[PDB]
Amino acid sequence: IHRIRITLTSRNVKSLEKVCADLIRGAKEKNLKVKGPVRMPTKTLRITTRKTPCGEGSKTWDRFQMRIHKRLIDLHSPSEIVKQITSISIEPGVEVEVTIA
Amino acid sequence: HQQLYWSHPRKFGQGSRSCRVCSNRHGLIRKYGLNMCRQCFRQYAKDIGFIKLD
Amino acid sequence: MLMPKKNRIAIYELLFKEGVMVAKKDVHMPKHPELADKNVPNLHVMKAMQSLKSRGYVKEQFAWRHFYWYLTNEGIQYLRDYLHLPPEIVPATLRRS
Amino acid sequence: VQISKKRKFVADGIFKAELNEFLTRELAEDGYSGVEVRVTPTRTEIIILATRTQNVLGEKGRRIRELTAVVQKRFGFPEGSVELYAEKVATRGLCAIAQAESLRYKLLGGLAV
Amino acid sequence: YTTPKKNKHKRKKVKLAVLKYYKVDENGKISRLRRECPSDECGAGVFMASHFDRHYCGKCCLTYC
RNA sequence: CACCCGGCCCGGACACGGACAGGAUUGACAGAUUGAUAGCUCUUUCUCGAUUCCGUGGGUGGUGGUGCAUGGCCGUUCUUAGUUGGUGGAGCGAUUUGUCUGGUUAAUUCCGAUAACGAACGAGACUCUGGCAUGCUAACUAGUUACGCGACCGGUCGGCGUAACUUCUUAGAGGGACAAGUGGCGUUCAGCCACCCGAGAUUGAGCAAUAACAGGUCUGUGAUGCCCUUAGAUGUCCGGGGCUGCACGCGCGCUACACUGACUGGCUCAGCGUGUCCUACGCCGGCAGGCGCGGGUAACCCGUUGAACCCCAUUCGUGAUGGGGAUCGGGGAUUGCAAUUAUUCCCCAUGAACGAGGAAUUCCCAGUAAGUGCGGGUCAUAAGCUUGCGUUGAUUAAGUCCCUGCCCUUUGUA
Ligand SMILES: [Zn+2]
Ligand SMILES: [Zn+2]
């Protein structure tokens, strides 16, 4: 029951905000002590490569960005309740990692 | 024989590495463990998750 | 090519047991990872599957750098006759419905 | 030991891309439109969207559990953690890939362009 | 090319080679003409060679003077 | 790694014939041989067991040829405002009108004319990024304020532990700017210039049509048609050497020619972003580095990223000089199997041209030019390159079609 934390990590913002909000309101209605979403610095993966395969042109470059948005929600609740509240909330395009102490 | 076929060491160097797609060993993107040719990455960038913003 | 019978039967019995085969397209690879302890080079697996394909017993496909092989009804027939098993036994691809 | 979030999200990207490339070269003839992969620590499901599913399943669902045995043998996740599902495409007309594949296989039929 | 031609080594064809290994007498004395290889796996299964000035085993590559 | 010299290997599927357990074939100790401990080959025998080996058909390989056979991306025409059907009108017709006299716009952008009326793509809209919120939701992987305890003189603390919070920090939602308000000018129309209130009254990008280059790439590909070779190979591998070879001519660049500057010491500030290889701390060495023991798969550790120009002292003194550091001699370390034609790195010594560059010619309008460092990509070793990020921070212009080109409209053309 002690200090389970839940790390929600995704590339989409909307889906991550929706699922995390659902976990929070799902926990709040049960009268459980919850520490709110801790938004960490957004990880931006940059790749800059030549457009051309051959290498004859005006030396143009692509700029490929990949965004990683990470949220932490913390609970002071029993593991039995934590298991089912973590079980019910599934979404394609979010990764959830639960840790205790 | 057995001790001269693939005898030369390839722990390091450009010859040791190769593209995961086309097995080419030139203009290779080995950042974030992509391990892929620059031509092949540009083809597979979209469905990997890499997007062009600015 | 010239390879010992042990390697040949090991490749054939794996192919018959599972019903499919995967190779990594590299002639220098020391041992096939699924056939570890048996001491079967990847080269042997590729050429064995090539030899069985050329006749027309196994269907091959090629993705990025991997060979893929599916055992057909002619292959099932050929293997049962070559490996000498009773018709009762069928591959894992032909067990369920 | 576990890999970084950055490498993990990249790895999932390559998994998606390579799986797609394999599925295209396999099920091009049966108008493979697209794939959807949902991952659960219990078992990860792969959902194939194709024009004619009756064909991609095979004789009494034989070919589907060849494709299952392939991805299991190759990628190295444990057996009983994947079930390749084949769902019907809602409308085959509004899929560029399906229409492109159809045009290719009717051109291979020896018809005028 | 400067060299005339490089020819592959062809194995000299010998007829019924295992008859030189044994010398059976009329009453039955089965004497081994070539010496036995004293290594583990070879023991009783491999008859070590007898060259002009040395012994040699083709399997384990064991040599004696 | 294609190229040059020399040497192993089949990784020549499948089929037909011959061979063939009375053994098709495989591998090899020793000595010779070879650059090689390569059974490659020669002498000499051993060793494996229908997996092969010889002939024909037929394959399979290629960084082999052809980009003027091709596909895909990509560059350019072409960064400007261009582009096309339907039905109606005008010509026998190619074709034209719509798509425009005139205003107006960055814009075929709008207003308004109107044999055209309805449309479609491009432009705009759009998406990402900068600039504002003492309002909102939150936070021992971010901080402040207060209080307690401590160290040193009410003060300094990035010395430690609790309580109010979110100003600073991260980042979701939502607000905010629209020529909206005022005054001129504008067929009082589209709109233009100035000014108040404001964080802002033009931020920087990404995406980009129709129609074409005989543009580049077969040396990105298991994208590919023909052709060339295919077992003394253009396959593949192993040893070397070459890609760097220098009487000369061009093209991007870096360091300079000094005193607004070098040198020596002191002081004090970043941002982007990367680490299964990034590194703190302790010890030994002048230094490159050597050992030992820790943290970090990362707002957690490196790290409060104590960066450089710059700032403040010292020495130098117009001298090819303590400017400049090329070229050359010795040593001492780190990669790596291997460093010579010196891979990088450190120390002492050597001390060339160069005194601001002829004809000519490039780039650029504000956080811009330029100076100045730092991170990413290459990366075992690794930046004089490019791709990003901050830092200090200007002069001149708000115009023109003179040069070089571009768009529309008239004409002229052999
Ligand atoms: Zn590639
Ligand atoms: Zn022996």
Q: How is this structure best described in words?
A:
- Chain A is an alpha+beta fold.
- Chain A has one domain (1-101).
- Chain A contains two helices and five strands.
- Chain B is of the alpha+beta class and 54 residues long.
- Chain B contains one helix and three strands.
- In chain B, strand 1 and strand 2 (36-37) form a beta hairpin.
- Chain C has one domain.
- Chain C has three helices and three strands.
- A three-stranded antiparallel beta sheet of chain C has the order 1-3-2.
- In chain C, helix 1 (5-18) crosses helix 3.
- The longest helix of chain C is centred in the N-terminal third of the chain and has 14 residues, at 5-18.
- The interface between A and B is medium-sized, with 12 and 15 residues.
- Strand 4 (64-76) of chain A pairs antiparallel with strand 3 of chain B, so a sheet runs across the interface.
- One zinc ion is lined by residues 19, 21-22, 24, 36-37, 39-40 of chain B.
- Chain A binds one RNA strand of 414 nucleotides through residues 13, 16-17, 35-42, 44, 46-61, 63, 65, 69, 71-72, 74.
- It is classed as ribosome.
- The entry lists the keywords eIF5B, translation, initiation, eIF1A, ribosome.
Descriptive key words:
part of a larger assembly; 5 chains; D: 113 residues; alpha+beta; 3-stranded mixed β-sheet; 3 strands; globular; E: mainly beta; two-stranded antiparallel ribbon; extended; binds zinc ion; RNA-binding
Largest sheet properties of chain B? 2 strands, antiparallel
The sequence of SSEs of chain C as H and E is HEHEEH
What is the terminal separation of chain B in angstroms?
56 Å
Walk across the major sheet of chain B and give the strand order. Answer: 1-2
Helix tally of chain B equals: 1
Protein name (chain D): Small ribosomal subunit protein uS3
Modified residues (Phosphothreonine) (chain D): 40, 68
Subcellular location (chain D): Cytoplasm; Nucleus; Nucleus, Nucleolus; Mitochondrion inner membrane
Cross-link (Glycyl lysine isopeptide (Lys-Gly) (interchain with G-Cter in ubiquitin)) (chain D): 88
